[PDB]
């Protein structure tokens, strides 16, 4: 079942891949891995191939590596990145040292899309819907993305979208406030906060909270949604943060409609519901999907949830070689998704 491999050197790093991947082209250099674009002869599609960098260098890396392979292996949704293939040149566990991931290439990310055209309200609806449709799935599996922003959104010719690059346990502009200063532990509703920041930017054409530092940005967010009320304060477990918050000039939530005059009132209505300060009162992906704003795309019977995701591994305490063997096990056990 094992294919023929071939090696080459690009960007001073050796890649050993099955022959099915051709015309490899260095897309970028990253600290965690380096990614080549290639042509997958099997699927007839351009794909992305990630060679993970020093994946078993420390306990931390091994566990990081394991976590990503598990998470990627679990994702099976049209609006989320799928694992096309994962492989190692290694023929046994002892010689196992390198890991490559293959994922689909949609050619463009949301930043680049906005860069060369203006989006109709129709485009925005469809994009957000799909973000929300994927988040429903992700969240039902008890996963948090942890990083949503335009550059982790991949879009094609037909305006189809996939979510990519999950935070593995610029960016600040789309972060929820409760996690920007790490006020409390992360709810999956920080992702909803991100969607709100994205939607606004698509709608108006500008970054909503383009802060320069955490303090600058927090102040920017609080001018819109007001300062945290007494009920919210209690949830913050750090007294330092609390004392800090109480030092702030008290502020009322502003009226969104005045801030987004000329946008679809429904869109504004939905933004209102996503950009709620208290995370416990933010609309959910499931809830948001049913909003009138998406009347023309919403189908309850076609917005599926995920299987349960076992994350108990996270509280395991293993040797480097044990995380490594777990990972080899996942590489070995992968089942390629059915051909289209």
């Amino acid at each position: 079942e094992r294919p023929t491999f071939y090696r080459q050197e690009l960007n001073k790093t050796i890649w050993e891949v099955p022959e099915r991947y051709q015309n490899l082209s260095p897309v970028g250099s990253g600290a965690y891995g380096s990614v080549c674009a290639a042509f997958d002869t099997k699927t007839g599609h351009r794909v992305a191939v990630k060679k993970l960098s020093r994946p078993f260098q420390s306990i931390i890396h091994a566990k990081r590596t394991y976590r990503e392979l598990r998470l990627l292996k679990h994702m099976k949704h049209e609006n989320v990145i799928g694992l096309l293939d994962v492989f190692t040149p290694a023929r046994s566990l002892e010689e196992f040292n390198d890991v490559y991931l293959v994922t689909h290439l949609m050619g463009a990310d949301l930043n680049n899309i906005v860069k060369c055209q203006k989006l109709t309200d129709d485009h925005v609806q469809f994009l957000i819907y799909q973000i929300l449709r994927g988040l429903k799935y992700i969240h039902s599996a008890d996963i948090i993305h942890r990083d949503l922003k335009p550059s982790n959104l991949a879009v094609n010719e037909d305006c189809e979208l996939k979510i990519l690059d999950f935070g593995l346990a610029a960016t600040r502009w789309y972060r929820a406030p409760e996690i920007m200063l790490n006020w409390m532990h992360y709810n999956q509703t920080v992702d909803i906060w991100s969607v709100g920041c994205i939607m606004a930017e698509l709608l108006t054409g500008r970054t909503l909270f383009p802060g320069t530092d955490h303090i600058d940005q927090l102040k920017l967010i609080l001018r819109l949604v007001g300062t945290p009320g007494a009920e919210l304060l209690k949830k913050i477990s750090s007294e330092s943060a609390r004392n800090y918050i109480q030092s702030l000039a008290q502020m009322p939530k502003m009226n969104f409609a005045n801030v987004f005059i000329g946008a679809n009132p429904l869109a504004v209505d939905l933004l209102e519901k996503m950009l709620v300060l208290d995370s416990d009162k933010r609309i959910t992906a499931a809830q948001a999907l049913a909003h009138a704003y998406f009347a023309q795309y919403h189908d309850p019977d076609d917005e599926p949830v995920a299987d349960p995701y076992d994350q108990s591994f996270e509280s395991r305490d293993l040797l480097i070689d044990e995380w490594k063997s777990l990972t080899y096990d996942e590489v070995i056990s992968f089942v390629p998704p059915p051909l289209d």
């Binding site: 463009a108 680049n112 055209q117 037909d158």
Partner: peptide, 8 residues
């Protein structure tokens, strides 16, 4: 059938 232009 809404569509987008890809960046070149």
């Amino acid at each position: 059938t809404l569509s987008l232009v890809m960046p070149s």
